[PDB]
PDB file of C-alpha atoms in Angstrom:
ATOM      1  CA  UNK K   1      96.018   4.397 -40.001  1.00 21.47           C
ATOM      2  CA  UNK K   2      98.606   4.234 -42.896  1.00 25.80           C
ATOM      3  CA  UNK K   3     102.317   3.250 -42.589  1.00 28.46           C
ATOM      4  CA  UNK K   4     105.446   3.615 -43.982  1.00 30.21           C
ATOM      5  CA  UNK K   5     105.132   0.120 -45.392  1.00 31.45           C
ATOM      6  CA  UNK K   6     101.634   1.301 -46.887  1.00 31.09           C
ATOM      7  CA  UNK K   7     103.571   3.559 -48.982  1.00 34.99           C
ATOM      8  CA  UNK K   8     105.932   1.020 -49.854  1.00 34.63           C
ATOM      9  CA  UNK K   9     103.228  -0.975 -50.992  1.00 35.60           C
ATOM     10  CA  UNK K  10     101.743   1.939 -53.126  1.00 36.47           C
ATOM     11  CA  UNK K  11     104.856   2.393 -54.894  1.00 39.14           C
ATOM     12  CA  UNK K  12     105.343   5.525 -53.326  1.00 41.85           C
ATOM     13  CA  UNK K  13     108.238   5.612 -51.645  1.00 41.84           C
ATOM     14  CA  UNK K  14     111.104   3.513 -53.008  1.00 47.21           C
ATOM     15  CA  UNK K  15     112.429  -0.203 -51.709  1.00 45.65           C
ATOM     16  CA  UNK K  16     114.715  -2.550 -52.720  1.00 44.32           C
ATOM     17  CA  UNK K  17     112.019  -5.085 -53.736  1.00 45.23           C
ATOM     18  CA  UNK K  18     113.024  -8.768 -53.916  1.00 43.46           C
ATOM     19  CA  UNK K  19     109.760  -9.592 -55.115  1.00 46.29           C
ATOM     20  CA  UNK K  20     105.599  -9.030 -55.713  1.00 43.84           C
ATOM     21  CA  UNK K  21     102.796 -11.161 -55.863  1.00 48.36           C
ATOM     22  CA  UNK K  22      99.055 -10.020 -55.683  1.00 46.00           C
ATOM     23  CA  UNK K  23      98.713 -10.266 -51.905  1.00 45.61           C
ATOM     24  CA  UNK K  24     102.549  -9.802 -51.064  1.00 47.06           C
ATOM     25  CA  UNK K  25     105.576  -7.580 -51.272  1.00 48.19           C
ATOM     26  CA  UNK K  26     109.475  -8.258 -50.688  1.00 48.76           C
ATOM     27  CA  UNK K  27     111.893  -6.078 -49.766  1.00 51.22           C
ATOM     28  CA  UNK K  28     115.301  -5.443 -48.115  1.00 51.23           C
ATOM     29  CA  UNK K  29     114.996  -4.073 -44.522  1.00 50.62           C
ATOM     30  CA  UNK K  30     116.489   0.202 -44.764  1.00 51.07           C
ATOM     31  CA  UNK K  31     118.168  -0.647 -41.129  1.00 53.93           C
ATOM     32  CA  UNK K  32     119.496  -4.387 -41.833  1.00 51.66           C
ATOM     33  CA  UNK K  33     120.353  -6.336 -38.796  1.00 50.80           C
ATOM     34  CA  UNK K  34     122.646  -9.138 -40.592  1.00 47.77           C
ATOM     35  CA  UNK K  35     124.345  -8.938 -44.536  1.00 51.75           C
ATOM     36  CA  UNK K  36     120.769 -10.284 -45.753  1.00 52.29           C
ATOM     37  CA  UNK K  37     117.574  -8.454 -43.751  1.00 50.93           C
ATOM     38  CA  UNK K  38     114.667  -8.259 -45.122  1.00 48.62           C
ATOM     39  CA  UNK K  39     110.615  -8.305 -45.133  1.00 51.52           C
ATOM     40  CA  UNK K  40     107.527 -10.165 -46.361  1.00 52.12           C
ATOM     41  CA  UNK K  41     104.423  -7.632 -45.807  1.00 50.12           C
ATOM     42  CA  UNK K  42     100.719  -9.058 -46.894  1.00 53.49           C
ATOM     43  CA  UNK K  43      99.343  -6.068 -49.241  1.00 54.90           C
ATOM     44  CA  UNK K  44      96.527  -6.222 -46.902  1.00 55.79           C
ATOM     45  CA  UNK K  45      96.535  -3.780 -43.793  1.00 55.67           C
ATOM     46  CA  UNK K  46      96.581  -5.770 -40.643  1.00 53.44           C
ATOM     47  CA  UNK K  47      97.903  -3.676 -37.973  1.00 56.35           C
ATOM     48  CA  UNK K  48      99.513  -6.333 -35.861  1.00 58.02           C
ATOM     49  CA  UNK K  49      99.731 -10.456 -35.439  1.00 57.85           C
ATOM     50  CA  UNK K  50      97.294 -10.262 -32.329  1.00 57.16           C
ATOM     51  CA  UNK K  51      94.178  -8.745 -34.395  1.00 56.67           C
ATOM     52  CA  UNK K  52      94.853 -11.552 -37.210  1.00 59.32           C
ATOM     53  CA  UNK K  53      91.679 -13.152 -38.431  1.00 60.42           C
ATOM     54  CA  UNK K  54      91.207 -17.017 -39.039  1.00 59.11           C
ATOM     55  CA  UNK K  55      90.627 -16.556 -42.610  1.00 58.33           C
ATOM     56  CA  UNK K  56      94.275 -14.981 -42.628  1.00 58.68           C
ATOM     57  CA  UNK K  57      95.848 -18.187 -42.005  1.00 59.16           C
ATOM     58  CA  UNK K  58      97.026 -19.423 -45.200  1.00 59.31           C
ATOM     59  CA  UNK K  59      98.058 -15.473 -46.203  1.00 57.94           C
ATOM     60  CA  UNK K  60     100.218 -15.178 -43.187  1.00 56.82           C
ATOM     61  CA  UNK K  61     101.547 -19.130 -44.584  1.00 52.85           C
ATOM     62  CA  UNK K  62     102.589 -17.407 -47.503  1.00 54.23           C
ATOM     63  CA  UNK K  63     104.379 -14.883 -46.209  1.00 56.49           C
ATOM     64  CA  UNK K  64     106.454 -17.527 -44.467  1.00 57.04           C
ATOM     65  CA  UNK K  65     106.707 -19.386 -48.129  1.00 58.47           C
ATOM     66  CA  UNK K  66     107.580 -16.255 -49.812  1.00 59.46           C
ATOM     67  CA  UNK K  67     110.294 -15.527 -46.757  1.00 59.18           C
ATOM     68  CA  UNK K  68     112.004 -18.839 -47.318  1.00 58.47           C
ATOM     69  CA  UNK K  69     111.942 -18.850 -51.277  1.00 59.65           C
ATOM     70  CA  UNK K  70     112.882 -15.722 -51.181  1.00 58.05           C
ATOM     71  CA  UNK K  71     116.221 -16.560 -49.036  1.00 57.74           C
ATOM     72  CA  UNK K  72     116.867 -19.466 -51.072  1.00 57.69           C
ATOM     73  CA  UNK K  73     116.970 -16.973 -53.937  1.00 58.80           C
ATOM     74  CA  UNK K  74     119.690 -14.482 -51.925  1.00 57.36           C
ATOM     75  CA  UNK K  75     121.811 -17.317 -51.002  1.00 59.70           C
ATOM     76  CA  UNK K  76     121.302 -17.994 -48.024  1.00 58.45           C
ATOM     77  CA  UNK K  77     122.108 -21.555 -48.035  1.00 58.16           C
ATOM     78  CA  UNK K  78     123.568 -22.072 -44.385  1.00 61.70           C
ATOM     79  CA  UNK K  79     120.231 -20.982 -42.785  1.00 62.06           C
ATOM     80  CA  UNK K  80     118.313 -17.543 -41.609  1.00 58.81           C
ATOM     81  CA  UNK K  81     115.958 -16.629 -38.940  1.00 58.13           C
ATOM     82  CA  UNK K  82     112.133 -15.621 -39.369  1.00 56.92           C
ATOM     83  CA  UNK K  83     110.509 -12.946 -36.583  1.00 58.87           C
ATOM     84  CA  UNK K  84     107.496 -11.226 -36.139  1.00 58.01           C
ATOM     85  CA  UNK K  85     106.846  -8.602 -33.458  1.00 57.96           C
ATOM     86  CA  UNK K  86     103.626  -7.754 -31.925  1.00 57.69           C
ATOM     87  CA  UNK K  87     103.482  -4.559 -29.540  1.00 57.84           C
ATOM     88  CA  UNK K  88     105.639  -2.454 -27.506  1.00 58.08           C
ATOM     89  CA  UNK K  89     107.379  -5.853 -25.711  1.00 57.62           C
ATOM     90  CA  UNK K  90     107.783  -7.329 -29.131  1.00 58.74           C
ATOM     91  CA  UNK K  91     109.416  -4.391 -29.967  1.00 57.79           C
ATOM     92  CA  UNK K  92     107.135  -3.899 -33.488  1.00 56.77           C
ATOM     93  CA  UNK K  93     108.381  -1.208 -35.183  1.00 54.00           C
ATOM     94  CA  UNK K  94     105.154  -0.921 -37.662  1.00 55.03           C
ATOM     95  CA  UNK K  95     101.821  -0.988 -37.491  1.00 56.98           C
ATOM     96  CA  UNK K  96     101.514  -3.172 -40.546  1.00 58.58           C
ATOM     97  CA  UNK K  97     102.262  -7.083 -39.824  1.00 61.15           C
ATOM     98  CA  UNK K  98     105.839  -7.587 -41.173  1.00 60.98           C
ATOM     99  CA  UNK K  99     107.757 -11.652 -41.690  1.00 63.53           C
ATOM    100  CA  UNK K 100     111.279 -10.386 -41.354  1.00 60.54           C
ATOM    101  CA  UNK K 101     114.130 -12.503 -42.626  1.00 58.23           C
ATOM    102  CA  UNK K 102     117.471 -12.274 -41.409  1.00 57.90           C
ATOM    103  CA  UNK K 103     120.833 -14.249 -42.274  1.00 59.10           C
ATOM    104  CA  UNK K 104     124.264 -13.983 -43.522  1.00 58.40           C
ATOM    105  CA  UNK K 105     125.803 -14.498 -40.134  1.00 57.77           C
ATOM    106  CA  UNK K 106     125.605 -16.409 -37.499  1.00 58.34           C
ATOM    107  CA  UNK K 107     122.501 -15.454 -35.375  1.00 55.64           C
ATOM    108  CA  UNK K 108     122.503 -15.927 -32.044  1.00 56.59           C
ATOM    109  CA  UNK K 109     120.531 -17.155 -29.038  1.00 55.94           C
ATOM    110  CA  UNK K 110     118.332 -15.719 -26.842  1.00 55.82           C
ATOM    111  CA  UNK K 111     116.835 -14.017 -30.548  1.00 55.42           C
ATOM    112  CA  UNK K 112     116.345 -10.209 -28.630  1.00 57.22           C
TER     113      UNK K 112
ATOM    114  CA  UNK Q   1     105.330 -43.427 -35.717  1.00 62.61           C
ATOM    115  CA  UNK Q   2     103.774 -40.159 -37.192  1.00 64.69           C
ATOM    116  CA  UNK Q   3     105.683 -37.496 -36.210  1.00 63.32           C
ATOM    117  CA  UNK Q   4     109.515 -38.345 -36.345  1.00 64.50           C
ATOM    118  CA  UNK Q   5     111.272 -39.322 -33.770  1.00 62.43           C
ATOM    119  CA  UNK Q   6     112.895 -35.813 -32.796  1.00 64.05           C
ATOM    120  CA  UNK Q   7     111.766 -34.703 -29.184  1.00 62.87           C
ATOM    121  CA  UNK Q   8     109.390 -33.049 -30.835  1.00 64.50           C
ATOM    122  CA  UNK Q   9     107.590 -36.172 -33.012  1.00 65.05           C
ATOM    123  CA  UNK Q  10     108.296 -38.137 -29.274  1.00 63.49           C
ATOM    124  CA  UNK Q  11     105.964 -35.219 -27.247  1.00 60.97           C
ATOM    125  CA  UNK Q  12     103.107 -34.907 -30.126  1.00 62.73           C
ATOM    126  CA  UNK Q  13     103.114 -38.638 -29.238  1.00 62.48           C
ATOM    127  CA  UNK Q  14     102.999 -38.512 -25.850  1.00 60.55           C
ATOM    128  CA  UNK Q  15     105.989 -40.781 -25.092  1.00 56.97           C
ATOM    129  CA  UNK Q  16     108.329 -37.454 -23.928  1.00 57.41           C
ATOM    130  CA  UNK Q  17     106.495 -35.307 -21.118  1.00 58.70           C
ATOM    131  CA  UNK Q  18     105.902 -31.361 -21.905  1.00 59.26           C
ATOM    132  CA  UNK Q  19     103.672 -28.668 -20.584  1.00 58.32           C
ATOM    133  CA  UNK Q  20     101.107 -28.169 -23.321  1.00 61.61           C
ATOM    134  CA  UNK Q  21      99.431 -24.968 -23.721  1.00 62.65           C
ATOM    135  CA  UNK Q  22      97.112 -25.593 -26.477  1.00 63.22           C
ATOM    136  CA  UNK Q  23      96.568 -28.665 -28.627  1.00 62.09           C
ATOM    137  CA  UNK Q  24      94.407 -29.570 -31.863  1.00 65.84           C
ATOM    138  CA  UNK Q  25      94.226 -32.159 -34.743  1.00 64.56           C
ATOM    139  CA  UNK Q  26      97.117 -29.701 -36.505  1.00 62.08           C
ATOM    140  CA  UNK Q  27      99.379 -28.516 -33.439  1.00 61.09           C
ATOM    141  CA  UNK Q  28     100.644 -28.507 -30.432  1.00 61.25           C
ATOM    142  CA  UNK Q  29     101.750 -25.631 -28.582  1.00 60.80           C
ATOM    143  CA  UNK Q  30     103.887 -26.372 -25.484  1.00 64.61           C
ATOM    144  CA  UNK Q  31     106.317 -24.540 -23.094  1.00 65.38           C
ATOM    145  CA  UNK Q  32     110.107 -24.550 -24.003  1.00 67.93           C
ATOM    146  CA  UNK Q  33     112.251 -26.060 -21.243  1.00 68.93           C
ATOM    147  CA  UNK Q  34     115.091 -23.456 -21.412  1.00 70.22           C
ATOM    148  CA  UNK Q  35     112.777 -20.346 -21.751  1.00 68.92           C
ATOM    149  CA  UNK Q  36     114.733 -17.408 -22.655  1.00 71.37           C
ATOM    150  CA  UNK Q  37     111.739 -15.250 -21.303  1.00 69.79           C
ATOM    151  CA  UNK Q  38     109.352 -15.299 -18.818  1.00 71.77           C
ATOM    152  CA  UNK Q  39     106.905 -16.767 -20.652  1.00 74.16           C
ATOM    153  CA  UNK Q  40     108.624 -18.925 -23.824  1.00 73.27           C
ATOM    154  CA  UNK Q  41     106.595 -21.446 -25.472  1.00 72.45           C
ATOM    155  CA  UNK Q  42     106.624 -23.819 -28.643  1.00 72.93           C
ATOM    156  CA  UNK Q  43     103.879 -24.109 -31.761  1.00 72.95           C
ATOM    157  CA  UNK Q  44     104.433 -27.146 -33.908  1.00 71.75           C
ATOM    158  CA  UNK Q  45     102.730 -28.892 -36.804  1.00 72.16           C
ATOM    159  CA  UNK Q  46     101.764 -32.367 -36.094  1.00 67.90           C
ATOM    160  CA  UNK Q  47     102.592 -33.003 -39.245  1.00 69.69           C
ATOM    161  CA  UNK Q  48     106.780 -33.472 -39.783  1.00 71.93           C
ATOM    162  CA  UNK Q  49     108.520 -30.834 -41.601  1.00 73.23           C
ATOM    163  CA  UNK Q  50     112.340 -30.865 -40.305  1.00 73.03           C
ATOM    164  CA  UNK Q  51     112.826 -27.433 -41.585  1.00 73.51           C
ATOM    165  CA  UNK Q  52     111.281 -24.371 -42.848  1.00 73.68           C
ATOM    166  CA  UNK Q  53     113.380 -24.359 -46.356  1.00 70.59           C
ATOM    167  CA  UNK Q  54     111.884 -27.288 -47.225  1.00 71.53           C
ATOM    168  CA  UNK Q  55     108.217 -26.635 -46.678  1.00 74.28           C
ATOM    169  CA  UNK Q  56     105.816 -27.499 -49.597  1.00 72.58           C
ATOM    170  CA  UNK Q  57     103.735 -24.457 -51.009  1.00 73.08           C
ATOM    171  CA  UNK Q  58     100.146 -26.462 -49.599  1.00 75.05           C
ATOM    172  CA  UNK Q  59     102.002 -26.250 -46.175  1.00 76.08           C
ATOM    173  CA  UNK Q  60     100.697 -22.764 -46.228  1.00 74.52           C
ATOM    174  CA  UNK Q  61      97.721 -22.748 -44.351  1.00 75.70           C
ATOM    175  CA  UNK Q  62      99.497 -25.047 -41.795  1.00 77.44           C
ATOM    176  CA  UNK Q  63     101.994 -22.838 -41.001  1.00 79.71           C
ATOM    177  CA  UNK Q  64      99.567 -19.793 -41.105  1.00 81.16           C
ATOM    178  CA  UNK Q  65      97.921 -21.609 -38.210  1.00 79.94           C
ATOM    179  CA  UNK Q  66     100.695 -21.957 -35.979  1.00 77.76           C
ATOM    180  CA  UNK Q  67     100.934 -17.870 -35.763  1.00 81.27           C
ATOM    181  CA  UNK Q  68      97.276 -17.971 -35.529  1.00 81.13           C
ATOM    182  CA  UNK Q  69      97.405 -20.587 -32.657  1.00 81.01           C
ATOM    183  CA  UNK Q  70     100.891 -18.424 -30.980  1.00 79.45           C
ATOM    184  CA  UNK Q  71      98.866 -15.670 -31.420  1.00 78.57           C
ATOM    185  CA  UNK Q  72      96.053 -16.990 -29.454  1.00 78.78           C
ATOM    186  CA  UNK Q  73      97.838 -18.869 -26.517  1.00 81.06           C
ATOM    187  CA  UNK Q  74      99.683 -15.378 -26.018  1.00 83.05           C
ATOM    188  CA  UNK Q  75      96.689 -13.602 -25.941  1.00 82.70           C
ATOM    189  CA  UNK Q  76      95.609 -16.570 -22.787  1.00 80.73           C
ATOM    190  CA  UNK Q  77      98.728 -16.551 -20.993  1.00 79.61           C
ATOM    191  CA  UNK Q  78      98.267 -12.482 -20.967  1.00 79.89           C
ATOM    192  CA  UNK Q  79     101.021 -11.245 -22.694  1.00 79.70           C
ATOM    193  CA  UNK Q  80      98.876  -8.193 -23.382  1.00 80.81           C
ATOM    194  CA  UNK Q  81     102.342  -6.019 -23.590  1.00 75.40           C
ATOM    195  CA  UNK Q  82     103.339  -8.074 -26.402  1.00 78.94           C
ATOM    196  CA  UNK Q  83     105.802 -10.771 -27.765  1.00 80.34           C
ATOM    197  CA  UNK Q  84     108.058 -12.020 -30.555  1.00 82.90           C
ATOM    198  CA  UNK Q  85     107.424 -15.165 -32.880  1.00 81.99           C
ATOM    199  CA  UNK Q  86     110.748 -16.827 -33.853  1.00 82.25           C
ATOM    200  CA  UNK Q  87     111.655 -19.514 -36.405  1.00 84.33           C
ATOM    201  CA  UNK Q  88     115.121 -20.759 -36.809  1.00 83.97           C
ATOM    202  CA  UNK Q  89     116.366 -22.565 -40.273  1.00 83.59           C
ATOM    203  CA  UNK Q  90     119.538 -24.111 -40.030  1.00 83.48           C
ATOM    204  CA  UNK Q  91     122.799 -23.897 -38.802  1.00 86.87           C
ATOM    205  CA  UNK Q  92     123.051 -19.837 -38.913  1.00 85.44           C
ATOM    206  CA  UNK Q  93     119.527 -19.476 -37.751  1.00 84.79           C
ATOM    207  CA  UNK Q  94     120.266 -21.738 -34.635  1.00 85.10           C
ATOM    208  CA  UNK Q  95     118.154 -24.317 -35.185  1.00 85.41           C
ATOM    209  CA  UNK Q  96     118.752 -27.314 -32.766  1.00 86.69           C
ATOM    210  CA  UNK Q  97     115.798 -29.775 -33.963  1.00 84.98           C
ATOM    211  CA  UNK Q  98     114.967 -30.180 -37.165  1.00 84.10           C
ATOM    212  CA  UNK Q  99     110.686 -30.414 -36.465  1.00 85.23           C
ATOM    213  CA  UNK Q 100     109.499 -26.992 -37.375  1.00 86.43           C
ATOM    214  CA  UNK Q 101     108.883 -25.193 -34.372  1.00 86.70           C
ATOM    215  CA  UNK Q 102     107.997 -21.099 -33.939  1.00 88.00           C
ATOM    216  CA  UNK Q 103     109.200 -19.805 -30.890  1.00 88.89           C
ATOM    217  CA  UNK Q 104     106.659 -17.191 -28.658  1.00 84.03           C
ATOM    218  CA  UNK Q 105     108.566 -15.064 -26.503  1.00 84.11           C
ATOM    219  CA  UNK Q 106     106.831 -12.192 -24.179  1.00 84.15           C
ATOM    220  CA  UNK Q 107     106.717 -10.938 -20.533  1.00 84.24           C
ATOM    221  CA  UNK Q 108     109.733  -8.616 -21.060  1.00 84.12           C
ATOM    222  CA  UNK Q 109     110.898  -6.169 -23.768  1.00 85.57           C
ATOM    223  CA  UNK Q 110     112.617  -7.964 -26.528  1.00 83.74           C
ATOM    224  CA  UNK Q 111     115.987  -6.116 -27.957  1.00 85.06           C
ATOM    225  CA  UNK Q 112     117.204  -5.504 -31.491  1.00 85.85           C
ATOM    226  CA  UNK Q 113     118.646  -7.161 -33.348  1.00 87.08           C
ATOM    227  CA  UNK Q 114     116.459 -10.476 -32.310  1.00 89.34           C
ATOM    228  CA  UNK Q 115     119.832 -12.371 -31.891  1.00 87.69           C
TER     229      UNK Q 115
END
């Protein structure tokens, strides 16, 4: 099933992309949770973090390397948190595996 | 001493006690002691990295793995509901020790925002 971030992806919809690579996209979150919110998104479809395969390891790395460049690059200087949600507990709001970065204020403890 | 000598290099070590969940010749996945769910754990590299800003780009696949690995010890502790995967950077991320760690949280519903 496509998403939202699908569309995104396809350029058909607009975002406020931060940056693209090959296997990647960037982009600010459209509900931001902090002054800097947004997501890494591997082009490819998997649905969730519980159905990733082995061979996704070093793709979901680089969504993690692409998050924290990427934050470097906004500013964020005095630190940010990373999340991932799986399911209805993990309150995941897409069906399409999504890094989000959030910072620009303090963030606070327990994270949700 | 490989590892550091956080807590965290100290319990890949075995010289700090922890309940481990999962371990292999990359990780270690362990329960955190001041769970903020009812089921909170810890994945983190063997190898030391204090923090994730300063992760090298051929740290990729390492830190793929840990999600793979969180992913998988959720899956065996049945959180079949769901959970949320948490790192911290830094001082306005509320990171405590600098050892990269990713947090699993599950067995309740998570709010937004996630702190």
């Amino acid at each position: 099933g496509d998403t939202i971030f699908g569309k995104i992806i396809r350029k058909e919809i607009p975002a406020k992309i931060i940056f693209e690579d090959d296997r990647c996209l960037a982009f600010h979150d459209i509900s931001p949770q902090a002054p800097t919110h947004f997501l890494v998104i591997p082009k490819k479809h998997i649905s969730q973090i519980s159905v990733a395969e082995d061979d996704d390891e070093s793709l979901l790395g680089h969504l993690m390397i692409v998050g924290k460049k990427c934050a470097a690059d906004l500013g964020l200087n005095k630190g940010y948190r990373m999340v991932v949600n799986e399911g209805s507990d993990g309150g995941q709001s897409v069906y399409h595996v999504h890094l989000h970065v959030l910072g620009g204020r303090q963030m606070h403890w327990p994270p949700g």
